[PDB]
């Protein structure tokens, strides 16, 4: 029955002869077997086993070549050929990892799909030139309002998603994804983002739920997560973004665009440790190796936004970055800050506060930022930097009774951080985060109990699409807000307060 | 109910011992010296071609 | 060669077979029935009971 | 040829060199067994330094280890006894037993090690513990398939609050459970052991409820090291091939930790992390995918961890706190002060809290008590020096209800009558959203803060109120 | 039944007003009570006993 299926497959293996380059083993230990043989041999490059183990050569010298296995040291013994594939490390990339949960080889982990392949391009390859660039002002909307106006996010735009542990990292992150899906349903496939979460040395428990949460909203057929899990050996965490990223260069180079989001970049550094350490490399600081800078830099600038001769595309990047209580003076975040442009760092205090997202917006900031915005958010949110600015300040002054000045400004910022609390999971279209905001700043919501903020949103928004629907498809096809739009949308804030 | 479906994946299993037990009559048998040599002049060939 | 050679003298002299019942059994949880409810409890019986609730509740107090 | 004969070369602590002869070709993992007067010491083979020459940790005593002495090669990872006549027996590391009536009986063995469960074996958690823990319960509860881990220093009753968890919820559900101890002292063993035997979880009949699988600190660091691989393997047989879901307890698994990081720096890993394995992600990682929920049985954890120097921004404990999926803080001053037990309210966190996952009401009161007590040690630097009298009557009023709420984590234990001498109490997962919910929508500040120290459920809430009256 | 226990154990309260102490006018009306609900709960778990021998 199984039998014949597996009967189907053994006939398909037969007596292989010819094999290249050879080398034997002659001391094995910690996953570091070292070889006798492979005198002519590229720099990382691929061998095979005889008992199918594989490994990269990082430690190149004549008396010994220092491979780096893979997997299992009890399949590996003294005396065992060692075969020269004769193929640097290079990895499947196509348009068919759509849909797929891949290993960090390649192959479906999930036994969902096949994979529909056109290429191998190698893990680690050379950012393009200076001319293969063009200036960031493409928009993105992640769904949460705070994050698309404050600090908007751009197309080829890295910017950090920093913060502490379990409190709702993977949420700012999964919002996004799940907002590209509005794009991905129609048909204009250079504003299509394919998807890339990259889960770096992070448990299959874990991301059995990151997932199942895709399979309900519909969103495994353009996410492709590749897993390099807590099991999984120091090489393939190691390689796990750069086989990511690899993929995403597929898409951008056919002119097309896709995100892809690190997580987290906290573990990547501890597998190359892992690696450092028993390779003997030089010590540096903290106990995490000298040369992790390099490691991180040279996939960080490979997420660009490429020039119109290369199709008008970009690899769009989110890394996110795992403090161990808010330390961003620690050596590991402090190297990712300067090569990337902008962070977001969520704070603790928020999340104990019951505001989940607990996103902190004042320690945001991104370098380039608003250059890749949306117009209409811009009016209706430059007003809305000023007014929470204000607030944070005036809240260093607490309650008995104070200014007649101060009171105002408290009430004022608190409606509106009301307004930013928001459910978890729940994206918002250009035309509906738009009129809240615009709401917010006229004071025609900061006028309302705070009680009755989480009310007022809904019925808003309902109350809009019932009257004049019309006003909503304007205001997102144009992306803009014109004057004829502007007294219009005063007129309409002013009807739903009076009810 | 878990035994059964165990239990396919055995059936599997004990084909997978099967092959073992062919093996010993292969070194027993003088399949021993026919076979080896069957694999030997495939690699004298495969190595004239080189 | 001999990758076909062996696993066609496997795979023809030895099938799936599914085991013995007896076998399946044992490696299964056994079935054990209810045994014993349960007496209530005492609090004396007989005219044990009787004399001692009258004669300890003779007292009340102001 | 393979060899029998191996003569050792270098005994320098825990490390023990072997010169294997002609032809052996040494594989690492395998087990060498060396004949001495204290039995049988194993070594796990760990390097081969070349020329069938191993260097070895040993699970047995070296302080009689001689050279020149004849090592046989047994081969793979020594395999212990599995099975459900394996429960309530007590299991040595190298798979013996020091409950002394004969063996520990066997159908199948397995051997310590096992690969970790591929991603489509994973399923995720659809069950949802009670502890009875009126705190655990609000706060942050747990899922069969959850890792567990209850964080926290030293005199914070880190053993009472794992043999609470057994006191309850063993009996009450219908599968067996893993009792696993590593490097723990000769009086805890023996205190886990009278206790449950009274308690009939353990029983000298097999077929029991929980399984003893005692290694010690006075057995040398690989040992240590290798006490949970054996455990752990007795629940992956009942997940899978038995179909029964474990409720598995190791206790404290810092020992393993602290183990690796010993026989670390002397096998040549250079220390990593300041004093830790530069193996810490990949050991723990490969520990936690081997308990979880699959096709068939759902393997929830309830792991001990010890956070050193009672600081818990520490390289050792931050890197598990993302191993473990639901996590409790606990600390020195909570169990002085007499809340029993000494978990933190907002510092008690799940990844498997969902506002579905444990319904709507449950999630909103949680949250109010979340925001409740946040306010109140916000409040507590300015009652400190500016005063209780220049709170604003929204705010006096939360102290207020903080106050309650800080004294209705208070419950006492049956295995906390060492500090009390009140037993346990039992209360259900809906009795405790209820009462809490109650505090809050100022309906039950008629109550006094006593009277919610030192209750159970509701319905003792309401027996307090009364007693203290008169 | 269950009721007449619940209504009687009131009757009861303002009893032990009445007279001095209640010693075991206490410790029989929580008894009672108790273990009335408990043999409540326990039958809600209670099934009559079947085998399904046309599903498994």
Redesign the interface.
């Known amino acids: 029955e199984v039998s014949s299926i597996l009967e189907e497959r053994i006939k398909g293996v037969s007596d292989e002869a010819n094999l290249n380059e050879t080398g034997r083993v002659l001391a094995v230990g910690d996953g570091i077997a070292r070889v006798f043989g492979l005198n002519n041999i590229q720099a990382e490059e691929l061998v095979e086993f005889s008992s199918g183990v594989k490994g990269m050569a990082l430690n190149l010298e004549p008396g010994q070549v220092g491979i780096v296995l893979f997997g299992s040291d009890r399949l590996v013994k003294e005396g065992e050929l060692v075969k020269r594939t004769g193929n640097i490390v290079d990895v499947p990339v196509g348009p068919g990892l759509l849909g797929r949960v891949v290993d960090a080889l390649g192959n479906p982990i999930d036994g969902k799909g096949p994979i529909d392949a056109a290429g191998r391009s190698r893990a680690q390859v050379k950012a393009p030139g200076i001319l293969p660039r063009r200036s960031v002002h493409e928009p993105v909307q992640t769904g949460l309002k705070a994050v698309d106006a404050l600090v908007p996010i751009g197309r080829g735009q890295r910017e950090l998603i920093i913060g502490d542990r379990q409190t709702g990292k993977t949420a700012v992150a999964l919002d996004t994804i799940l907002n590209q899906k509005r794009w991905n349903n129609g048909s204009d496939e250079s504003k299509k983002l394919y998807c890339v979460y990259v889960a770096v040395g992070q448990k299959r428990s874990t991301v059995a739920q990151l997932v199942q949460t895709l399979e309900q909203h519909d969103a495994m057929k353009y996410s492709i997560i590749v897993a390099a899990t807590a099991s999984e050996a120091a090489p393939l965490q190691y390689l796990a973004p750069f086989t990511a990223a690899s993929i995403g260069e597929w898409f951008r180079d056919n002119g097309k665009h896709a995100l892809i989001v690190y997580d987290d970049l906290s573990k990547q550094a501890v597998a190359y440790r892992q690696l450092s350490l028993l390779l003997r490399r030089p010590p540096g600081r903290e106990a995490y190796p000298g040369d992790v800078f390099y490691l991180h830099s040279r996939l960080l600038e490979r997420a660009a936004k490429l020039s119109e001769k290369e199709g008008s595309g970009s690899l769009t990047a989110l890394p996110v970055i795992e403090t161990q209580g808010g330390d961003v003076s620690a050596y590991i975040p402090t190297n990712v800050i300067s090569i990337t442009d902008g962070q977001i760092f969520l704070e603790a205090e928020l999340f104990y506060k019951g505001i989940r997202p607990a996103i902190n917006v004042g320690l945001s900031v991104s370098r380039v930022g608003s250059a890749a915005q949306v117009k209409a958010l811009k009016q209706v949110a430059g007003s809305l930097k000023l007014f929470l600015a204000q607030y944070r300040e005036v809240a260093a002054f607490a309650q008995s009774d104070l200014d007649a000045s101060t009171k105002q400004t408290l009430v004022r910022g608190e409606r509106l951080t009301q307004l930013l609390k928001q459910n978890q999971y729940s994206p918002l279209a250009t035309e509906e985060q738009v009129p809240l905001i615009y709401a917010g700043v006229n004071g025609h919501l900061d006028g309302i109990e705070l009680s009755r903020i989480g009310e007022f949103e809904s019925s808003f928004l309902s109350y809009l699409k019932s009257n004049h629907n019309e006003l909503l498809t304007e205001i997102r096809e144009k992306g803009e807000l014109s004057k004829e739009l502007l007294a219009s949308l005063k007129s309409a804030t002013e009807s739903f307060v009076a009810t | 109910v878990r035994y059964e479906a165990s239990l396919r994946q055995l059936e599997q299993r004990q084909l997978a011992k099967s092959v073992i037990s062919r093996v010993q009559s292969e070194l027993g048998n003088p399949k021993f010296q026919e076979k080896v040599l069957q694999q030997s002049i495939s690699e004298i060939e495969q190595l004239l071609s080189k | 060669?001999?990758?076909?050679?062996?696993?066609l003298?496997?795979?023809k002299?030895?099938?799936?077979?599914?085991?013995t019942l007896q076998d399946?059994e044992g490696?299964?949880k056994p079935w054990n029935p209810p045994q014993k409810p349960n007496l209530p409890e005492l609090e004396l019986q007989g005219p044990e009971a009787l004399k001692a609730y009258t004669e300890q509740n003779v007292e009340?107090?102001? | 040829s393979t060899p029998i004969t191996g003569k050792v070369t270098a005994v320098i602590g825990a490390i023990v060199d072997v010169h294997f002869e002609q032809s052996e070709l040494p594989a690492i993992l395998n087990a060498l067994e060396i004949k001495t007067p204290q039995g049988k010491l194993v070594l796990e083979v760990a390097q081969h330094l070349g020329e069938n020459t191993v260097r070895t940790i040993a699970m047995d005593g070296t302080e009689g280890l001689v050279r020149g002495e004849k090592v046989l090669d047994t081969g793979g990872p020594i395999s212990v006894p599995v099975g459900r006549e394996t429960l309530g027996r007590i299991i040595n590391v190298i798979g013996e037993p020091i409950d002394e009536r004969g063996p520990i009986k066997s159908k199948l063995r397995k051997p310590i090690h096992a690969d970790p469960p591929s991603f489509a074996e994973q399923s995720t958690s659809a069950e949802i513990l009670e502890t009875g823990i009126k705190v655990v319960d609000l706060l942050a509860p747990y899922a069969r398939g959850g890792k567990i881990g209850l964080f926290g220093g030293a005199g914070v009753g880190k053993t009472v609050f794992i043999q609470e968890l057994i006191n309850n919820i063993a009996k009450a559900h219908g599968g067996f459970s893993v009792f696993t101890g590593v490097g723990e002292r000769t009086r805890e063993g023996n205190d886990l052991y009278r206790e449950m035997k009274e308690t009939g979880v353990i029983n000298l009949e097999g077929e029991s409820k929980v399984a003893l699988v005692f290694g010690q600190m006075n057995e040398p660091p690989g040992a240590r090291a290798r006490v949970a691989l054996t455990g752990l393997t007795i629940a992956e047989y009942f997940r899978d091939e038995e179909g029964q879901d474990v409720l598995l307890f190791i206790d404290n698994i810092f020992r393993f930790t602290q183990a690796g990081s010993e026989v670390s720096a002397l096998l040549g890993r250079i220390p990593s992390a300041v004093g830790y394995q530069p193996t810490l992600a990949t050991d723990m990682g490969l520990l936690q995918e081997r308990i979880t929920t699959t096709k068939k049985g759902s393997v929830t954890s309830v792991q001990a961890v010890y956070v050193p120097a009672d600081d818990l921004t520490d390289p050792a404990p931050a890197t598990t706190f993302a191993h473990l999926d639901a996590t409790t803080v606990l600390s020195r001053g909570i169990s002085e002060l007499g809340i029993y037990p000494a978990v933190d309210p907002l510092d008690s966190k799940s990844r498997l809290l969902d506002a579905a996952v444990v319904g709507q009401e449950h999630y909103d009161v949680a949250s109010k008590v979340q925001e409740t007590l946040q306010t109140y040690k916000s409040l507590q630097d300015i009652i400190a020096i500016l005063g209780m009298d220049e709170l604003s009557e929204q705010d006096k009023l939360t102290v207020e209800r903080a106050r309650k709420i800080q004294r209705f984590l208070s419950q006492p234990f049956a295995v906390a009558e060492v500090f009390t001498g009140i037993p346990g109490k039992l209360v259900r997962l809906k009795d405790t959203v209820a009462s809490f919910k109650a505090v809050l929508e100022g309906k039950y500040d008629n109550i006094p803060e006593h009277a919610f120290y030192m209750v159970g459920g509701i319905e003792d809430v309401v027996a307090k109120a009364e007693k203290l009256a008169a | 039944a269950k009721s007449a226990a619940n209504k009687l154990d009131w009757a009861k309260v303002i009893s032990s007003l009445r007279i001095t102490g209640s010693t075991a006018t206490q410790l029989s009306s929580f008894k009672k009570r108790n273990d009335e609900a408990r043999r409540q709960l326990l039958e809600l778990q209670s099934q009559p006993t079947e085998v399904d021998f046309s599903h498994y």
């Open positions: 060669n001999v990758i076909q050679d062996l696993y003298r496997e795979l002299d030895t099938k799936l077979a599914p085991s399946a490696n299964v009340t107090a102001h």
